[PDB]
Amino acid sequence: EAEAKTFTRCSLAREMYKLGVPKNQLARWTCIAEHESSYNTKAVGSLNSNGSRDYGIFQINNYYWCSPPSGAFSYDECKIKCEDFLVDSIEPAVKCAQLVLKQQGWTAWSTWKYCDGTLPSIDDCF
Structure with missing residues (x-):
């Protein structure tokens, strides 16, 4: 089964903020999700x-950021198994995306283009 564990703009924000992700990132992160x-x-x-293949809500890459369920080499920068993103919790994904963001920034997401402009305030979520 690959039934979705689907968050919403706001539920993702709320949970991200709870996990200590600054608010000013939340609109972008939800956009990217x-x-x-x-x-x-x-x-x-x-x-x-x-x-390569991308994993979880932030589509973390199995060559560079997470380790694939194979014996394939990965730089595994987040020091996680990719498949560990495939859980109900966003935390491993959030933690890893945080590291990505700090190291490569927002342009790291190929979807950043959908997200780099005028976004709504996330504070309607709060």
Whole structure:
């Protein structure tokens, strides 16, 4: 089964903020979740052109950021198994995306283009 664990703009924000993600990131993160995964923690991308695959709500990459359920090499920068993103909790995804954001910034998401402009305040969620 790959039934979605689907968050909403606001539920994702609320839970992200609870996890200590500054508010001023939340609109962007929700935007990115939307376009990366439709807020689905269970989302797994199709194979990328380079043979990689992206995991979870923020579509963390199994070549660089997380370790694949194979013996394939991964730089595994978040020091997590990718498949661990595939849970009901966003926390491992959030934690990893935080590291991504701090290291490569928002342009790290190929969906950043949908998200880099005028976004609604997230405070309607709060």
